[model samples]
Target: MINAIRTPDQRFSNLDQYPFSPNYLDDLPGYPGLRAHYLDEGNSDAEDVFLCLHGEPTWSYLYRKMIPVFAESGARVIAPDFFGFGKSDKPVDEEDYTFEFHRNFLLALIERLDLRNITLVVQDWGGFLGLTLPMADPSRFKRLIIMNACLMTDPVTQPAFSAFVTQPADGFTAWKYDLVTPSDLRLDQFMKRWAPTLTEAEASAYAAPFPDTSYQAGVRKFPKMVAQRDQACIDISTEAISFWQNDWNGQTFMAIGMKDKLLGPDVMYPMKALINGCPEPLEIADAGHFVQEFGEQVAREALKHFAETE
Candidate 1:
């Protein structure tokens, strides 16, 4: 069993009010007997299902606004916290978290849910992990909405982010950013609003996932995963593109924030160009990398329309 860091009582208190449920699934293939937690919202009987996958540092709570609208509209909403985030069981060792491990873990979740006709919403590392799974099994998903995210090979492409990831205090800085930055807000104000949202208990809940800096190995390593420029991430992305071209010629829409400091629109331009034949990319004005926070209503409407038409 993987040991997780203890959360503060205050954070737990705040997190509890959100009506969270725990889901346990077998560990990814090679890991020992460990189970991860995931959040499943809305009625099981709902015809449509929205599977929202969040990026690093944030959990299902990131989708708090969107989940309800989809759910009330009779769409089942599912958002799983990656192994180390939210209520999921955190691995004791940072080395235990790997790209392959996370990929397979999600593959298992889709299988376990037997989810079909899925409308996928992914951002940040969420896109990195979420996009790979559907490629492996395109039959399960119906449409994809990619926001402020990318799946590409060009490291020389995103220099600003590349430098950010390599900085000496990258982990610390990233944690601070995740806890604060919203894709749309100004940095200073974003930080201020972020801490107040969490009760003492909820704050602890968020913090508990990473007890010490060492536990942040996965957090720190994620940026490097994108920059590998090697065959690993590129190969996976290549496979996804091939699958999209060959088999699942469904809609893949892009709603990127122009103000994004990281994972700029240019990084996704190649993909937009490739999929342009399929659908026009939607640009949300004034939104940054964390588009959901700033443009939740726009995203919701756009996704709803996409689901209806596509």
Candidate 2:
């Protein structure tokens, strides 16, 4: 059994406005032994499912703004915390965090849940992993609701990435960002920088995943894990692209945070082109990387857009 550490629940006790209860599954297909956390809100028998995914340094708390809008629609809104990031189990060793590891974990969750008609919503690393899933079993997913995210080299495509996927390092250095074993990673600084409207409580929720340095291996290792030119990732991403461009007949809505320097319009605009039927994105002038921070308006507009267009 792989050694893993569970962050104490107390770390999540004061989560600003996040009040939806948790639903845990310890018996997902590939990794049956580990416990994963997710929020399954709204009608259980609802035909439409909104599957929300978050990326590096953030968790399900990132969706607090959008969940209500989705849930109120009577759609089953499921937001899962990837291992090592949310309320899910965290492996103490950064080596335990791998692209395949996270990807397979998500696949297991989808399989075990047997969720159908999924409206996949992804951002950041969520796109790195979530965007690739529909190719595996496209029938399970329906619409796509995307925001400030792009296929960030699958982390493997990054030049800073390891040639071998199995090797684990103490931390990452260079390229998009740097992460050494530091006492404090004030990601709240990034939060304020990107989403200036954030309150102290909301910003605190962004930092909630890593209570201290010991809990930050996942956060530090994500950037380096990307392989900029990994053919395997590119192959699947290409297939997914083809699927989105050709076979994807479901509804699609996109939003962009123009302020996001990393994966903003420069990157997302091209993605919009790749996605065949994607309409003009809902561009937010002020929102940054964490586009969901302004999710209330985004969600409202998306729901309204889908309603109007459909």
Candidate 3:
């Protein structure tokens, strides 16, 4: 059994604006003795399932603003906290967390839930990982809602996209420094600084999972993963580029957190060009890396865009 810890449910008690009930699975095929947590909201039997994925240092709570909007539209929403980041079990050893570990967890979860007609909602590391998912089960995914996230690819083949991984002396570098340099990384302060639009309570919700540094191994490892891209990550992400460019046949909605220095316009526009039929993005001038802070509008616009085409 992997040595892991679960955030006490008490820590999550009465979180601001996060009223969704908890759901857990301890018996997912490959992950044994570890309970995964996710929120299944709105119509359970709805054919349109919005599988929302949160990125580094954030949990499913990151989608708090957008979940209701999606549910209100009569779509089923599935927001799972990756193993270490949310109510899911956190492995004590950072070594236990890897790209395949997280990726496989998602693949297993989708299979277990038998999710179909997915509208993939992604941002930050969510986009990095979530964007690669469809090629594995293209039949299950039908649409996309991409926000402030990009795939991690080989620097040689995808220099521009890889710049987000290797570029220096800019917003992305500074953001990584802030995350990686901290010994006691206070996620609330980090969230407020990056998003800039978060309220005190909203920011605290981001920090709720980690009461101490011991709980932050996964958070610490994520930024490092970007810098230390393994060949496996590079190969899979590179192949995904081909999949999005050549094989993807789905509706796509793009949104830019214009103020985001990390994965803002410079990163997203190229991604738009790569994804077949991806339209011009809706710009959220005031939002930063955490575009979900402004997700209410993004969700409505995306739903409207999909409705218009249908």
Best by lDDT: 3
- Model 1 over residues 90-137: C-alpha lDDT tens digits? 665655666776777778788878888888888888887777777677
Q: How far out, in Å, is residue 279 in model 2? A: 0.4
Q: Supply the global lDDT for candidate 2.
A: 0.78
lDDT digits (tens) for residues 197-304 of candidate 2: 999888887777676777777777786555333466556665676666777777889999887656677668878877778899999998877899889988888788
**After aligning candidate 1 to the native by TM-score, how far in Å is the CA of 164 from where it should be?**
9.4
lDDT of 3 at 259: 86
Per-residue CA lDDT of candidate 3, range 1-310, in tens? Answer: 8899888888898689999999998979999999999999999999899999999889999899899999999999999999888899999888999998999999999999999999999998888899999999999999999999888997787776767655556677877888879888899999988877789999999999998888888998898898888888998999999999999989999999998877888889989999999999999988888889899999999999999886
Lowest lDDT 10-residue stretch of candidate 3: 161-170
Question: In candidate 3, residue 114 scores what lDDT?
Answer: 99
Q: Model 2: what TM-score?
A: 0.88
Q: What is the lDDT of residue 187 in candidate 3?
A: 92
TM-score quality measure for candidate 1 = 0.77
TM-score of each: 0.77, 0.88, 0.98
Which is the better candidate, 1 or 2, if ranked by lDDT? 2
Q: Looking at model 2, which ten-residue stretch has the lowest summed lDDT?
A: 166-175
lDDT of 3: 0.91
Q: Name the lDDT value of residue 306 in candidate 2.
A: 74
